[PDB]
């Protein structure tokens, strides 16, 4: 039996609404929506700074996949089809592009986490390291750059490498997290994204936690002898932000290795459809995370009644 | 014995201020009341300029009202052209804290000091197309503030030791020394016929000088606080003061005594610099509130506000054909506004 | 010798500088006034200058 | 006019190289560290140059301490009148202010405190950290272990002053000298932290004329300073 | 132009009191910080005691608390110090200083060498 029971279905199956997405593509909307009308009001009036440009881009990032990718799965609901059958004008896209794009703004927004987050730890841990060689030059050409490696990387399903497949909710599609021999050539990309994902919110666990024992000497240092956001403050932001990001990324990343190792006896689909579906409903919650921690609890407004 | 001449300094100075009170049959502001006002002037900047890394702190035009040189304490000496926006020259400085520039009429010869009390010379024309010193003044024991030329081969410098100095620069050596001032002086006047010229010493107080005979030839004691402007009117019969006490006086140097005031209570902060337009119906003047105001010569009122820079402002030149006014801030960006 | 030598300085320049040729505030302020109204046309800065003639247009 | 289309080129030819030079001096001056170098006339802070060195108005020392240049500029030569000139030192890095703590009477600690409050009170230097170097504690300590140089007689709080708890003598030193020596620095401390914050902060250190580690210690300031500087990026 | 003429001075025994008066002309005596200095015989320039624009904020030399009072009234543009006891070692020439600029409170008036905005000053001599 396959294992994607909805792999070739054209119906939505029932038991299931877009309440849920519906409230994570809201709150993420007013979030993005907030924190670029925050940014046009500074940029109206402060100055551009490298950490400025790349919070913008990460919200400018995250605001273009929850509408490139919400607006497909609500009409999906909203018409009881499946992406593969929701626009007779297509024949096999909406599906295979749906994944391409969540793929590519999941990565992209995991490379930008982990560049501001390594910006960071190089301007408190390493002053003159940063004062030498950064540059807003370093901080307008990081975000292109991660968006075309982010392309190039997700653009490897239309090239032999890895797949896209369809799961039981049927309103969206991802990377083929398993196969029933193990067709190296598809879990091949699959482990590839996985140890990726791993790897990049290991490094930007380790960035926080050096940028926080930096800023801990430096509130000492402070507290001695010598409305302003201090330091302890950006310590408890920063720890709020790596837990909620390694909570959002590590259950997608355990279900890739499950689907691509352990899983050889094969376990209730039912279970496992559930919980491919529960990994990502978590991972989106990054997105909506990110535009109150480095925006809205930082700009003065906020903080005035806050 | 002190005390006989603290008392004759005293009457002589009654006497000169009886004396300018009895010159004052009337005051500008009552006779100008029928002068029609400019009204509003809405300035914008044609031209930006960048390239400058520290803040830019002095600025000169040059006659032919193309290049203009601007100075910035990074150690940098830049010349721009003003319809290109093109960089001609980029000299660098051996004192990195510059604090003056002097744009020769011809063209052939710019002068820089500051903290160093070196005032060097650079040929902008020489044989070998570069840029090279061509003579160092180190006779003073201050900072060099401001700098004029009045030929190829003379100029008149101000330094931080209260007196100012005529250089003969084909020699190198003080031909002139003015003394007389108490404080340090900050800013020069060259007057269109470049016989006179005055200067602020934070002292409250200017003094108009020959250079000729090289004597202080008049004293106005108008301001009250340190003057770090001057420039004389285009007629060169009068010029204004800008002040650390946010207000800049007007004096002519044939009534001896303040002509008017423009200032407004808001305006608080201290002033850096001042020029005259062309007809000198307009004094813009730089304070320290990042923005330029362009006060009414005759009604003394703020014709107009320059609001570009977001930091202080250094300098302020108005072309010789008053086409555009360049000012310069700390922001190390020059805006020409016309 | 400084200290009383400053003080003489001062009274020969005060007494050099009040015997200058001072002249009423009225004449000079006749003079201002007519020399602006004279060069008014030809200030640019004062009256607005064409915008073809502006070189930074 | 081909002419002038042939000048125009050659300009931005001309404009593009004073470009590149620009850049790739923006990159050496951002690299260097400026510090400003000021203390009374009768401090040892010509002996502190001298050992960071090992007519002019201005002096300038260059030393690289971890691969990290620093020019320090002394501004001797020049007329007491500091009110003006003091401006340019805005964008300086940090103010190394060196303070002879045993001139105690005239009273010279008296004018060395006026001219910290002046400095730290000074619109343009607001945003200037300055490093207090409380020079010549040698001197001090002899003078006030045994002599007859009573503070309370030019310091009548210090008839009531205690020694802080967070202090941390010298292993060795006697309890007065230490005393004295906070003392002198609370003196300084009331003025700094009554008008500042997140604008410029003031680095005490107890030195010597003869101490090198105080070099050492400037880097450490310099680093904290950046490291204030750099926090301020995440304000939107 | 900015005048500051000193007054109140002279001789008196240890012990004794005076009342210096400094009246000051050519500027708005209130919006500026005032200062007494004083230079004794084969000495240099002394700080004695500084009063704010306001008069609120007051501060004296160790040396001088709790014996000497500045006060100002801008009703009139006059400056007072009242000596309440006086030791030889203050026979000095007392200075009335001016802020340097308007509404700041960085002043560099002891400065050494000849400072604009400071009137001559007037003796003060104690003996027994
Ligand atoms: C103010 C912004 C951050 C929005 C508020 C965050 C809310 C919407 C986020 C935070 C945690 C998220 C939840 C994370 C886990 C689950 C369990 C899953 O089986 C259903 C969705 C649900 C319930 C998510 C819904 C959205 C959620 C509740
Ligand atoms: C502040 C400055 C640096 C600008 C912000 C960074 C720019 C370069 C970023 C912000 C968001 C990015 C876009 C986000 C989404 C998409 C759609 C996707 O199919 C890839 C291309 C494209 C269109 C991205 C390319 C680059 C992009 C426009
Ligand atoms: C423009 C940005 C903000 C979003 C991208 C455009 C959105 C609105 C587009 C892209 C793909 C589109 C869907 C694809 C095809 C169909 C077929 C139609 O019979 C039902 C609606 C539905 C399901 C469309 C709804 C609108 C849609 C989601
Ligand atoms: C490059 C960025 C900015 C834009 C992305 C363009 C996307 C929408 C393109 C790139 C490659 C495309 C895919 C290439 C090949 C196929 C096979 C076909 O049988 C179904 C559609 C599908 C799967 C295409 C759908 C759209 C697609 C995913
Ligand atoms: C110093 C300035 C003027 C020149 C910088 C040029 C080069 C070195 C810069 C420009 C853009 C930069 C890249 C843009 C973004 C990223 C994402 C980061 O997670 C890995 C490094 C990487 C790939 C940067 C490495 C350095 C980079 C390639
Ligand atoms: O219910 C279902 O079938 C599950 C819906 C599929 C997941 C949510 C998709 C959509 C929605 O439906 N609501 C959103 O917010 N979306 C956008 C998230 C999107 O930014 C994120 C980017 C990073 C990687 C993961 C996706």
Redesign the interface.
């Known amino acids: 039996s396959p294992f994607y029971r909805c792999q070739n279905t054209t119906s939505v199956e029932k038991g299931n609404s877009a309440v849920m997405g519906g409230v994570l593509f809201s709150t993420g909307l007013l979030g993005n929506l907030l924190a670029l009308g925050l940014l046009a009001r500074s940029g109206l009036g402060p100055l551009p700074s490298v950490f400025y440009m790349l919070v913008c881009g990460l919200t400018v990032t995250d605001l273009l996949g929850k509408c490139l990718l919400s607006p497909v799965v609500l009409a999906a609901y909203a018409q009881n089809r499946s992406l593969r059958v929701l626009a007779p004008a297509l024949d096999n896209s909406l599906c295979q592009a749906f994944a391409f794009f969540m793929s590519f703004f999941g990565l992209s927004s995991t490379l930008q986490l982990l560049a501001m987050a390594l910006e960071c730890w190089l301007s408190l841990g390493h002053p003159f390291f940063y004062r030498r060689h950064i540059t807003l030059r370093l901080g307008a050409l990081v975000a292109p750059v991660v968006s075309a490696f982010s392309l190039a990387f997700c653009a490897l399903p239309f090239m032999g490498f890895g797949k896209f497949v369809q799961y039981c909710p049927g309103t969206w599609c991802f990377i083929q997290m398993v196969h029933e021999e193990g067709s190296l050539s598809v879990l091949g990309y699959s482990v590839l994204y996985s140890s990726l994902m791993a790897l990049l919110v290991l490094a930007t666990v380790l960035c926080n936690l050096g940028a926080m024992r930096n800023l801990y000497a430096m509130h000492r240092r402070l507290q001695r002898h010598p409305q302003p956001l201090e330091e302890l403050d950006h310590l408890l932001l920063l720890a709020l932000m790596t837990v909620l990001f390694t909570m959002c990324s590590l259950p997608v990343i355990y279900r890739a290795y499950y689907g691509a190792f352990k899983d050889v006896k094969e376990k209730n689909r039912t279970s496992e459809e559930a919980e491919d579906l529960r990994a990502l409903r978590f991972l989106s919650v990054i997105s909506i995370v990110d535009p109150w921690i480095f925006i809205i609890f930082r700009s003065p407004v906020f903080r005035i009644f806050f | 014995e002190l005390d006989q001449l603290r008392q004759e300094a005293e009457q002589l100075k009654n006497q000169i201020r009886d004396a300018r009170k009895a010159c004052a049959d009337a005051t500008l502001s009552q006779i100008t009341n029928n002068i029609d006002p400019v009204g509003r002037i809405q300035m914008r900047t044609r031209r930006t300029l960048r390239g400058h890394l520290a803040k830019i702190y002095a600025m000169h035009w040059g006659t032919d009202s193309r290049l203009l040189v601007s100075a910035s304490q990074d150690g940098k000496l830049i010349i721009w052209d003003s319809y290109t926006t093109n960089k001609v020259h980029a000299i660098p400085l051996r004192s990195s804290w510059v604090m003056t520039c002097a744009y020769a009429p011809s063209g052939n010869y710019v002068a820089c000091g500051g903290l160093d009390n070196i005032c060097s010379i650079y040929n902008l024309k020489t044989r070998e197309g570069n840029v090279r010193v061509s003579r160092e003044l180190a006779g003073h024991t201050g900072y060099l503030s401001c700098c004029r030329f009045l030929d190829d081969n003379q100029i008149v410098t101000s330094s931080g030791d209260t007196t100012c100095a005529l250089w003969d620069i084909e020699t190198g050596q003080q031909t002139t020394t003015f003394t007389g001032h108490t404080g340090d002086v900050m800013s020069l006047s060259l007057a269109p016929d470049t016989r006179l010229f005055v200067s602020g010493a934070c002292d409250a107080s200017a003094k108009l000088w020959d250079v000729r005979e090289g004597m202080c030839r008049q004293t106005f004691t108008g301001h009250e606080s340190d003057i770090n402007a001057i420039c004389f009117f285009p007629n060169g019969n009068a010029f204004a003061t800008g002040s650390d006490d946010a207000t800049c006086r007007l004096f002519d140097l044939r009534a001896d005594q303040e002509l008017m005031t423009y200032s407004h209570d808001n305006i608080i902060c201290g002033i850096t610099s001042v020029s005259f337009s062309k007809s000198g119906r307009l004094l813009l003047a730089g304070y320290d509130d990042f923005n330029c105001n362009v006060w009414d010569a005759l009604k003394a009122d703020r014709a107009g506000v320059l609001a570009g820079h977001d930091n202080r402002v250094s300098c302020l030149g108005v072309t010789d054909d008053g086409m555009a006014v360049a000012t310069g801030s700390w922001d190390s960006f020059l805006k020409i506004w016309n | 010798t400084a200290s009383i030598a400053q003080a003489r300085k001062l009274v020969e320049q005060l007494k050099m500088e009040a015997n200058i040729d001072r002249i009423k505030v009225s004449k000079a302020a006749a003079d201002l006034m007519a020399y602006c109204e004279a060069h008014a046309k030809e200030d640019p800065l004062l009256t607005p200058v064409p915008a073809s003639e502006n070189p930074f247009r | 006019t081909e002419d002038q289309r042939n000048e125009?080129k050659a300009?931005?030819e001309?404009?593009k190289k004073?470009?590149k030079?620009?850049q790739k001096?923006?990159?050496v001056?951002?690299?260097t560290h400026r510090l400003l170098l000021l203390g009374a006339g009768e401090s040892g802070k010509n002996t502190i140059v001298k050992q960071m060195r090992i007519?002019?108005?201005?002096f300038?020392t260059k030393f690289q301490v971890?691969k990290?240049n620093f020019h320090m500029?002394d501004?001797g030569?020049?007329?007491?009148?500091?009110?003006?000139?003091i401006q340019?030192?805005?964008?300086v890095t940090a103010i190394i202010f060196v303070v002879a703590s045993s001139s105690y009477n005239?009273?010279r600690l008296?004018?060395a405190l006026?001219?910290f409050?002046?400095?730290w009170?000074?619109?343009?230097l607001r945003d200037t950290s300055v490093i207090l170097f409380l020079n010549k504690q040698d001197l001090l300590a002899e003078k006030v272990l045994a002599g007859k140089s009573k503070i309370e007689?030019?310091?009548?709080?210090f008839a009531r002053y205690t020694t802080p708890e967070?202090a941390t003598p010298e292993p060795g030193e006697d309890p007065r000298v230490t005393r004295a020596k906070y003392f002198i620095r609370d003196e300084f401390?009331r003025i700094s932290?009554a008008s500042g914050?997140?604008r410029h902060?003031?680095?005490?250190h107890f030195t010597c004329s003869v101490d090198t580690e105080n070099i050492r210690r400037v880097f450490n300031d310099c680093?904290?300073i950046?490291?204030?500087m750099?926090?301020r990026?995440?304000?939107? | 132009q900015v005048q500051l003429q000193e007054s109140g001075g002279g001789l008196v025994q240890p012990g004794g009191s005076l009342r210096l008066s400094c009246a000051a002309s050519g500027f708005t005596f209130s919006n500026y910080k005032m200062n007494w200095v004083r230079q004794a015989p084969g000495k240099g320039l002394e700080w004695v005691s500084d009063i704010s624009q306001s008069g609120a904020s007051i501060s004296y030399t160790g040396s001088v608390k709790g014996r000497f009072t500045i006060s100002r009234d801008n009703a009139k543009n006059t400056l007072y110090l009242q000596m309440n006891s006086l030791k030889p070692e203050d026979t000095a020439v007392y200075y009335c200083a001016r802020c340097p600029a308007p509404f700041t409170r960085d002043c560099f008036d002891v400065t050494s060498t000849t400072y604009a905005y400071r009137g001559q000053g007037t003796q003060v001599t104690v003996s027994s």
Do not use: M
């Not at chain 4, 007519?55 to 201005?58: K, L, Q």
């Open positions: 125009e300009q931005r001309a404009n004073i470009e030079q620009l001096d923006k990159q001056y951002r690299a007519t002019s108005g201005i300038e971890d990290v500029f501004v030569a020049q007329r007491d009148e500091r009110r003006k000139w340019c030192f805005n964008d005239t009273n008296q004018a006026k001219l409050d002046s400095i009170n000074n619109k343009w007689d030019y310091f009548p709080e967070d401390l932290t914050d997140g902060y003031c680095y005490p680093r904290d950046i490291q204030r750099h926090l990026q995440y304000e939107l």
